[PDB]
Design a protein around this ligand. Structure first.
Ligand SMILES: CCC[C@H](NC(=O)[C@H](CC(C)C)NP(=O)(O)CNC(=O)OCc1ccccc1)C(=O)O
Ligand SMILES: [Ca+2]
Ligand SMILES: [Ca+2]
Ligand SMILES: [Ca+2]
Ligand SMILES: [Ca+2]
Ligand SMILES: [Zn+2]
Length: 316
C-alpha cells in the first residue's frame, strides 16, 4: 500500500517485545519498506485462501495474542533478509529485492509452515505439537530459504535432491538463528515444538538420530513417504554440515571444524553456482568441494574438512 513508513511495537509468540516496521495509511499495516521492495505480512483468518488480507492495525501496537504470530513472521522475515544481504550480498530471495510475503493464522490447528511457490505460510499449530510456527526464527528462515533454493539451484522436492533442498533450509535456518544470536543451537523448531515438553525439537542437525533421522548414507530411507524422505534423509546432509562447522568424530571419522561463517560461504556458493534441480548427494559433495576450493584453495583445511565430513556420513 502507499503510505509513510512507521515503527510499531508488539509482542511475539514467546512473549518478547520487539519493534516492527509498519506503513501508515488510515491503518498501520505490516508492511516494512526498509528492506528491498518490502516485507508484507497477511492475515489468513484461520482459512486457507491466500494470501488473505494485508495485516491492518488501528494503533500500531501489536500486543494482542492474535497479533503475536504476525509480529514474529514480519520481524523474522526482516532478520532473514538482513542475513542474506549482509552475509551473502543477496537481495531478497530472487536476488533482485522481490517483495517478501507471509500469511499467518493459516487454517485451524495447522501443524506446519511452507513456501507455496509465491509466499510463506504459517499455521498456528494445535497447541500440543506446535504453537504458532512463526515463533521460530529457524522456521521462518527455513521457509524463506525454500524460496532462495527455488530461484537458484531449483532442487526438485523429492528423493535425494529433495533431501538436499530440505537440508539447505535447515542449514540456513540455523545460520540465521545464530546470526540473530538468541538461544542459538543446531536443533530445528525447538522454540515452537511441543510446548508441553522441554528440551526436544523437530529435528537435530548435530545428532539427527535423536529424532529418528539417518546420520549416515547407509541408513537412508528409500520408501515413498514424505516425498521419498526429504525431511528424513536431510539428516545425512545436516550432519555433514554440522561436522564441517563444529567438527567431531562420527563412526570413527574425524572432521576438523572450520566454523559457521565458512560453512555458510561454502554452502551458499554450492547452492547458487553448482547445484542443479537433479543434484544427488554425491553431486552435492562435489559441489561443496569445488565451492571450498574456489574460496580457500585446493590445499586448504576448508577443502579437507568438507571431504572429511562427507566421508563421515558415507557420501562419496
Ligand atoms: C511437522 C512438519 C515437519 C515437516 N515440515 C518442515 O520441516 C517445515 C516446517 C518446520 C521447519 C517447522 N515445513 P516445510 O519443509 O516448508 C513443508 N513443505 C511442504 O509443505 O512442501 C510441500 C509443498 C507445498 C506447497 C508447494 C509445493 C510443495 C514436514 O512437512 O514433514
Ligand atoms: Ca493494535
Ligand atoms: Ca534456539
Ligand atoms: Ca534452532
Ligand atoms: Ca518442546
Ligand atoms: Zn522445508
Amino acid at each position: 500500500i502507499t503510505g509513510t513508513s512507521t515503527v510499531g511495537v508488539g509482542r511475539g509468540v514467546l512473549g518478547d517485545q520487539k519493534n516492527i516496521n509498519t506503513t501508515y495509511s488510515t491503518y498501520y499495516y505490516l508492511q516494512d519498506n526498509t528492506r528491498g521492495n518490502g516485507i508484507f505480512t497477511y492475515d489468513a483468518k484461520y482459512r486457507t485462501t491466500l494470501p488473505g488480507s494485508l495485516w491492518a492495525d488501528a494503533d500500531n501496537q501489536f500486543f494482542a495474542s492474535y497479533d503475536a504470530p504476525a509480529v514474529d513472521a514480519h520481524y523474522y522475515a526482516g532478520v532473514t533478509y538482513d542475513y542474506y544481504k549482509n552475509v551473502h550480498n543477496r537481495l531478497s530471495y530472487d536476488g533482485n529485492n522481490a517483495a517478501i510475503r507471509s500469511s499467518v493464522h493459516y487454517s485451524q490447528g495447522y501443524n506446519n509452515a511452507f513456501w507455496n511457490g509465491s509466499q510463506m505460510v504459517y499455521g498456528d499449530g494445535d497447541g500440543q505439537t506446535f504453537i504458532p510456527l512463526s515463533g521460530g526464527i529457524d522456521v521462518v528462515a527455513h521457509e524463506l530459504t525454500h524460496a532462495v533454493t527455488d530461484y537458484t539451484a531449483g532442487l526438485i522436492y523429492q528423493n535425494e535432491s529433495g533431501a538436499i533442498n530440505e537440508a539447505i533450509s535447515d542449514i540456513f535456518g540455523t545460520l540465521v538463528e545464530f546470526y540473530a544470536n538468541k538461544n542459538p543451537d543446531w536443533e530445528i523448531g525447538e522454540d515452537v515444538y511441543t510446548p508441553g515438553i522441554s528440551g526436544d525439537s523437530l529435528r537435530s542437525m548435530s545428532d539427527p538420530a535423536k529424532y529418528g533421522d539417518p546420520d549416515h548414507y547407509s541408513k537412508r530411507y528409500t520408501g515413498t513417504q514424505d516425498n521419498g524422505g526429504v525431511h528424513i534423509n536431510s539428516g545425512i546432509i545436516n550432519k555433514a554440515a554440522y561436522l564441517i562447522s563444529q567438527g567431531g568424530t562420527h563412526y570413527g571419522v574425524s572432521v576438523v571444524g572450520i566454523g559457521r561463517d565458512k560453512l555458510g560461504k561454502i554452502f551458499y556458493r554450492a547452492l547458487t553456482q553448482y547445484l542443479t534441480p537433479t543434484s544427488n548427494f554425491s553431486q552435492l559433495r562435489a559441489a561443496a568441494v569445488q565451492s571450498a576450493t574456489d574460496l580457500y584453495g585446493s590445499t586448504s583445511q576448508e577443502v579437507a574438512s568438507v571431504k572429511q565430513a562427507f566421508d563421515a556420513v558415507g557420501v562419496k
